Structure formats: structure tokens, C-alpha cells
Design a protein around this ligand. Structure first.
Ligand SMILES: *[C@@H]1O[C@H](CO)[C@@H](O)[C@H](O)[C@H]1NC(C)=O
Lengths: 49, 43
């Protein structure tokens, strides 16, 4: 067993609009920092369901 | 059978307003983000 970072993040506004008009979120966070965009997925290698 | 000092008065409270003073706090903030790299999608 090793570490466990956990960070709390605001969704993007397009997603806010999705959330509260469909009762569902996308299984991916994406934020750009410096140059490139970074991205996380729910279970590994998942799609954007 | 038939049959009172006067003066000037100043009243004082106990005073409760706690004493303020500013304090300088020196500290450093190290932050470690970590990422993966495949094709053009950085994880
Ligand atoms: C997931 O889908 C939304 C809309 O379908 C899109 O805006 C978002 O960029 C996608 N995220 C990915 C592909 O990582």
C-alpha cells in the first residue's frame, strides 16, 4: 500500500449544465495547466461515458 | 417632637476589548503534481 492524493475539483460549466438538466456527470475530468491539457478517467482506460 | 453628601462622579468599565496586534508569518509552500505521457494525452 502506498500514497493517496485526493483533490476536490469544480466541474466545467458545460458539465454543470449537463449535471442539473440530466442528473448525470461525465466520467472524465480535464484541466489545462501551463501548456498541455491533463485528463483523468474513472476506472482505468475507460471512455467518456 | 419635630425633626446627604453632594459631589461629582465618574464611572469606569472593566474593559473587555481584547488586545490586537499584527503578526508576521513566514512559510513555504511546496506542491507536487505528477503526470503520465502517452501520444498527446497527458494523464
Ligand atoms: C467528454 O465529453 C464531453 C462532451 O461529450 C467533452 O466536452 C469532453 O471534452 C470529453 N472529455 C474527454 C474526451 O476527455
Amino acid at each position: 500500500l502506498l500514497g493517496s492524493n485526493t483533490e476536490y475539483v469544480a466541474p466545467p460549466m458545460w458539465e454543470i449544465h449537463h449535471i442539473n438538466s440530466h442528473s448525470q456527470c461525465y466520467s472524465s475530468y480535464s484541466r489545462v495547466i501551463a501548456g498541455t491539457v491533463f485528463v483523468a478517467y474513472h476506472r482505468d482506460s475507460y471512455e467518456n461515458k | 417632637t419635630s425633626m446627604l453628601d453632594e459631589g461629582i462622579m465618574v464611572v469606569y468599565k472593566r474593559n473587555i476589548v481584547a488586545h490586537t496586534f499584527k503578526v508576521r508569518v513566514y512559510q513555504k509552500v511546496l506542491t507536487f503534481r505528477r503526470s503520465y505521457a502517452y501520444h498527446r494525452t497527458t494523464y
